[PDB]
């Protein structure tokens, strides 16, 4: 499948390529409904 592992610094554009959406609130789930 894959040869050698490469490691490098994390560019901000590369981090935005990893992601799937900005987190903006510190709340996690609700506990009244367990849906997040």
């Amino acid at each position: 499948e894959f040869d050698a592992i490469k490691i490098a610094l994390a560019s901000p554009d590369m981090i935005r390529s990893w992601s799937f959406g900005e987190v903006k609130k510190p709340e996690t789930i609700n506990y009244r409904t367990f849906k997040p």
Binding site: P26, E27, T28, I29, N30, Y31, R32
Partner: peptide, 23 residues
């Protein structure tokens, strides 16, 4: 209507000496 679970989080290391590390 929030009962945010981060106010229910168990302090699961409640017996550790405060000077120990890595946890």
């Amino acid at each position: 209507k929030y009962e945010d679970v981060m106010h229910r989080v168990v302090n699961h290391a409640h017996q550790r000496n405060p000077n120990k590390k890595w946890s």
